[PDB]
Amino acid sequence: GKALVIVESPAKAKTINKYLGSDYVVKSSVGHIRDLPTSGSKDERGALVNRMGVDPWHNWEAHYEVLPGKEKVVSELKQLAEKADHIYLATDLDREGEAIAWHLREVIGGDDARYSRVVFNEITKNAIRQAFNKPGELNIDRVNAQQARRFMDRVVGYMVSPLLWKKIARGLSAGRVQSVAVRLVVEREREIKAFVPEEFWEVDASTTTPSGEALALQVTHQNDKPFRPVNKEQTQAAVSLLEKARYSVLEREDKPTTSKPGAPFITSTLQQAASTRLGFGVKKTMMMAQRLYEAGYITYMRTDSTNLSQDAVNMVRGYISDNFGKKYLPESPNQYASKENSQEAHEAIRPSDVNVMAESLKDMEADAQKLYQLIWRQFVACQMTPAKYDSTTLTVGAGDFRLKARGRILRFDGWTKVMPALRKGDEDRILPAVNKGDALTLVELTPAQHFTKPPARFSEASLVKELEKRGIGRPSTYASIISTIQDRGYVRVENRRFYAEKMGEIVTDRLEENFRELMNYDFTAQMENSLDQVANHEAEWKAVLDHFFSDFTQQLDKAEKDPEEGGMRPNQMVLTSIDCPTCGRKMGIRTASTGVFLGCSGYALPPKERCKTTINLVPENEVLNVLEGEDAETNALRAKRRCPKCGTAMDSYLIDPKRKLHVCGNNPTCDGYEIEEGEFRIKGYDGPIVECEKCGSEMHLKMGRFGKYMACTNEECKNTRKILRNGEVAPPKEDPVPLPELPCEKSDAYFVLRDGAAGVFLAANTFPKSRETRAPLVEELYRFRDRLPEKLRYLADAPQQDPEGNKTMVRFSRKTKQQYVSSEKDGKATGWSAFYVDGKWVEGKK
Amino acid sequence: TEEFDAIKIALASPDMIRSWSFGEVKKPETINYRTFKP
Ligand SMILES: [Zn+2]
Ligand SMILES: [Zn+2]
Ligand SMILES: [Zn+2]
């Protein structure tokens, strides 16, 4: 027989082929072969259900579809399935793999006695052998759960997005869990901007023992109360009183301390660790983890189970016994408990073979070697003996004041040996062996000034931790949430820290007001739990989908109504005194999907009195100083101005090289604005950076009906250039000429010839939409020779074919500022060229 | 011509060589072939 195994990745195909062999043919079904519709390719409800594909009213008929370019793979798979006798669906463990397997099954057909569903947590010889020995049936319940999730997300996205376009702004999007993540980020932003840092001082003391050893302490009580001076003068007075006073070590404390290793990684823990130690965010962490799994070195990277197989435990215990030895074993395995709702059938993220060191990963990029090293170190550490520390605490008294030292000294290191700390902590030092009731001699003392920390901005990993705490999303979702909140323009990530765009605040407030049930963390958690119940087969998918859809439709039909009826409030204006360059009027501050901008109220006046003039801002970037550590965020908050009308901080954007603009955090709910001739810095447009040949200023890439065209930032100079196939940029049309007779090849358009210092190039008529460009062939210029402007005619005189009979193309020699003709084979240059030498085309090797 | 008496040699200060030069050359091009012009 020949048995066909269908696997999503090609790398997974290669790795599994390593262990399957000649009897099995492995075919890589790249991604989702079958998916709900995407492109356009009571009639309103009909068009809505056709856009969705899903029809919620007609019992969720789904109309799945197979995307452009999948059909080749579908054909190949069908042919192989006709050839093969048993078809093996070896997708990954999770619901996404089950959905992919179901799609494959349903396309190929023959369901009942021809599909085996293979389940392995690692791509290794023993695991694959055990997986193929007794294959499972396709678990339709998990498929139904995945479909339920997909249907919910498409229902919410397509039904909400036109509402947000109408009320707030076109080019918004929405999503069930995405909106709740944005709500979390916006709530933390509001907590931060509300915060008003207090100020507190601290004093540090330097002492020597009678035995000449040296000790440094910190001062924490005055008059038996907490020592916390408010101002400089108070601190200086305290320092004086301290210096005058005489010090004695009235307290001597000692005690052993033990530290246990961390649990083996679940996916959220792996992302937090990779962020903290290696700096990888979420996307890089999960991409490298997926590569490491597909290569076969680590177990499946989507898990919330800390469990380990007996094989794993025995292997790692053997490794510890052989390398480290008995003191680090310890006597019995370190158990770790995952959540009761966790996929306890799954394993943790662990090495597939503990002896494979990270350096040995010849075929893994260095970042993946680092990630594997982190996984290996954690896995080894988790089973080792706890470290042992002995700790000393000292308190010293002088006058009205008491001052303290704490220190720990490290005496067995077992888990810390494999998994060291990144840096020494404040308590990772040696306090000298002062006696109980010892004496001390005194050295000069230092004050310090501090401002209370605001709540810390989310990192990608700390947001994933927050989601894991609340129960919003699941291990497979987290990377998609973290990506989509950024891609959709509600949140931005900078300094490895999360920042919330004003549009994210607007959309968050509107969605909370209208769709309070959808946005509430508890109902999101309960929905996720109900999908888990579906996967358990504790619940019926269609049922919960119907319940969701009924509630959602009630809330939508309420929300659609007019704002006086109680629907979604519009994107209300806030108004400021600035003169519109077109009509001088007062100007107001506005938010669009593009950003935050300055608008003139004539936008709301009918055509007769309409004004479309707009002014375009650049926000000030916060530049957090890594060297300031924990201070870096606090000082950023200190840097901000504060709104006159309220305690909320203010956010800053330039308007002129002479002028700078401050806007309140609760804009547009708060209408405070400030303008300062103490301006800072404004940024303009962006793209491929180019220099304008007519004025030396920066030039940037733009789109609109005549092209993806390149335009200069100097408002005094409308010099533009354009995009082409075999260069970065091309100057403007020294003589442009259309050709209806050259069709485009990637699109239905027609070609037009142009000229700049880049050379002479073809470009499609619908240029921003088509974007298609190529260099002309000499035979093409010969065919249209009559249309060519007088100067271009010589290029049609050029030799049309090289000596090999390869076809020829026209090129610019930047080293000699002249056109020449060259030939290509397989798209590569043949290394032949011909040049114009004053009426005599001449040819040779390049 | 210059009626020099002797010859002197020393290391080249960067400001001195920059003072010699009548311009900087920044691109590898040599001569155009369309028209024999630099
Ligand atoms: Zn105006
Ligand atoms: Zn305010
Ligand atoms: Zn210009």
DSSP state of A359: G
**Structure letter (DSSP) for residue A275:** I
- Please enumerate in sequence order all residues whose Cβ is within 8 A of that of A444, keeping only pairs 6 or more positions apart, or say none: A206, A243
Angle, helices A460-470 vs A282-295, to 10°: value is: 80
A673 forms beta bridges with: A663
DSSP symbols for A797-827: HS-SB-TT--BEEEEEETTTTEEEEEEEETT
Record the tokens describing residue A146, joined without a space.
């995945």
Q: Which two tokens stand for residue A173?
A: 């999007």
Phi, psi of A701, rounded to the nearest 5 degrees: -95, 130
Q: Which two tokens stand for residue A667?
A: 């804009």
Taking residue A148's Cβ as centre, other Cβ atoms within 10 Å add up to: 24
A846 interfacial to chain B (CB closer than 8 Å): no
> Within its chain, how far is the Cα of A162 from the centroid?
26
Q: Does A841 touch chain B (CB under 8 A)?
A: no
d(CA A724, CA A720): 14
Task: Please check whether residue B28 touches A, CB under 8 A.
Answer: yes
Could you give phi then psi for residue A777, rounded to 5 degrees?
A: -85, 150
Q: How far apart are CA A58 and CA A73, in angstroms?
A: 32
Q: Distance from CA of residue A818 to its chain's centroid?
A: 46
Residues A266, A683: Cα–Cα separation, whole Å: 42
Q: Which ligand neighbours the alpha carbon of A601 most closely?
A: 1
Which of B26, B32, B34 best tests the A interface by mutation, with the highest count of A CBs <10 A?
Answer: B34
Distances (CA, A) of A415 to A265, A420, A481, A559: 15, 8, 34, 57
Decide: helix, strand or coil at residue A49: helix
Sign of the C-alpha dihedral, residues A603, A605, A606, A610?
A: negative
Ligand number with the minimum distance to the CA of A193: 2
HSE-up (13 A, CA, CB side) for residue A825: 9
User: How many Å apart are CA A153 and CA A53, to the nearest integer?
Assistant: 13
CA distances for A804 relative to A420, A807, A811, angstroms:
65, 9, 19
Report the residue numbers after which chain A has a gap, meaning the C atom sits over 2.5 angstroms from the next written residue's N, or none. Answer: 41
**Contact flag B32-A814 (C-beta cutoff 8 Å):** no
Q: Is A448 left (phi over 0), alpha (psi -120 to 50) or beta?
A: beta
Residue of A143, A87, A142, A524 lying closest to A345 (CA atoms): A142
User: What interhelical angle do A95-108 and A140-167 show, nearest 10?
Assistant: 100
Asked if A365 and A297 touch (Cβ cutoff 8 Å), the reply is no
Report the alpha-carbon distance of residue A141 to residue A542 in Å, rounded. Answer: 12
Per-residue b/e over A202-234, b at no fewer than 16 CB within 10 Å?
bbebebebeeeeebebebebbeeeebebeeeee
Would strands A707-712 and A720-724 be described as parallel, antiparallel, or unpaired?
antiparallel
CB atoms within 10 A of CB A755: 19
Chain B residues touching residue A814 (CB < 8 angstroms): 29
Q: Does residue A24 have an active-site annotation?
A: no
Partners of B29 on chain A (C-beta within 8 Å) are: 814-816
Residue closest to A175 by CA, chosen among A518, A514, A492: A518
- The answer to whether A641 touches A653, Cβ cutoff 8 Å, is no
Q: Are A759 and A747 in contact (CB under 8 A)?
A: no
In this structure, the dihedral spanned by the alpha carbons of residues A545, A550, A553 and A558, taken in order and rounded to 10 degrees, is: -150
Q: Given CB atoms, is B25 within the 8 Å cutoff of chain A?
A: no
Q: Give the separation between CA A526 and CA A156, rounded to whole angstroms.
A: 17
Q: Over A435-495, what HEC string results? A: CCCCECEEEEEEEEEEECCCCCCCCHHHHHHHHHHHCCCCCCCHHHHHHHHHHCCCEEEEC
Contact A390, A254 (CB under 8 A): yes
- Whether residues B32 and A817 touch (CB distance < 8 A) is answered with yes
- Please tell me which residue in A247, A300, A372, A653 is annotated as part of the active site: A300
Q: Name the helix (H) or strand (E) containing A166.
A: helix A140-167
| Cβ(A507)–Cβ(A490) below 8 Å | yes
CA-CA distance, A337 to A315, in Å (whole number)? 20
Nearest to A787 by CA among A839, A732, A738: A738
Could you tell me if residue A762 is left (phi over 0), alpha (psi between -120 and 50 degrees) or otherwise beta? Answer: beta
CA distances from B13 to B7, B18, B25 (A): 18, 9, 19
Rounded Cα gap, residues B7 and A337, in angstroms: 89
Q: What would the two tokens of residue A803 be?
A: 């000596």
3-state secondary structure of A783: helix
Closest Cα partner for A447 from A266, A613, A605, A232?
A232
Cβ burial A101-113 (10 Å sphere, 16+ → b, else e): bbbbbebbeeeee
Residue A642 Cα to ligand 1 midpoint, Å, equals 29
A835 to chain B, any CB pair closer than 8 A? The answer is yes
Q: How far is the C-alpha of A415 from the C-alpha of A330, rounded, in Å?
A: 11
Any bridge partners for residue A843, and if so which?
A834
Give the resolution value in Å: 3.8
Beta bridge partners of A833: A822, A844
Q: How many CA atoms lie within 13 A of A147 on its CB side?
A: 26
Inter-helix orientation angle A521-536/A176-194, to 10°: 150
A818/B32 Cα distance (integer angstroms): 7
Tell me how far apart the alpha carbons of residues B28 and A82 are, in angstroms, rounded to a whole number.
Answer: 62
Nearest CA to CA, how far is B16 from chain A (Å)? Answer: 30
Query: Tokens representing A414?
Result: 């077992």
CA distance A663 to A674: 7
B32 chain-A contacts, CB cut-off 8 A: 816-818
Please tell me the distance from the alpha carbon of residue A183 to that of residue A481, in angstroms, as a whole number: 13
Side chain identity at residue A301, one-letter code: M
CA dist A741 to A502, A529, A770, A782, A788, Å?
Answer: 50, 61, 17, 13, 14
Residues in a beta bridge with A598: A589, A615
Q: How far apart are CA A711 and CA A702, in angstroms?
A: 7
Residue A272, H or E segment: helix A267-273
Q: CA-to-CA distance for A724 and A709, rounded, in angstroms?
A: 10
Please count the other Cβ atoms lying within 10 Å of the Cβ belonging to residue A240: 10
Give φ, ψ of A576 to 5 degrees. Answer: -145, 160
**Residue labelled with tokens 């002014």:** A615
CA gap A475, A418 in Å, rounded: 27
> What is the Cα–Cα distance from A134 to A440, expressed in whole angstroms?
75
SS3 for A535? helix
Residues 6+ apart with CB under 8 A from A469: none
Three-state SS letters, A720-772 = EEEEECCEEEECCCCCCEEEEEEECCCCCCEEEEEEECCEEEEEECCHHHHCC
- Crossing angle of helices A502-514/A176-194, nearest 10°? 120
Distance between A792 CA and the closest CA of chain B, angstroms: 14
B20 CA: distance to closest CA in chain A (Å): 26
Q: Which of A817, A840, A841, A842 to mutate to test the interface with B (most CBs of B within 10 A)?
A: A817
Which residue type does A409 have? I
CA angle (A34 as vertex; A29, A39 as ends), nearest 5: 125
Residue pair A708/A700 in contact (Cβ under 8 Å)? The answer is: no
What b/e readout covers A19-48, taking b as 16+ CB neighbours within 10 angstroms? bbeeebbbbbbeebbbbbbeeeeeeeeeeb
Q: How far is CA A104 from CA A73, A94, A123, A154, A652, in A?
A: 11, 16, 21, 22, 53
Q: CA A478, CA A178: separation in Å to the nearest integer?
A: 10
Closest CA relative to residue A394, chosen from A402, A385, A386, A404: A404
Quick one: DSSP state of residue A787? T
The answer to whether A756 touches A731, Cβ cutoff 8 Å, is yes
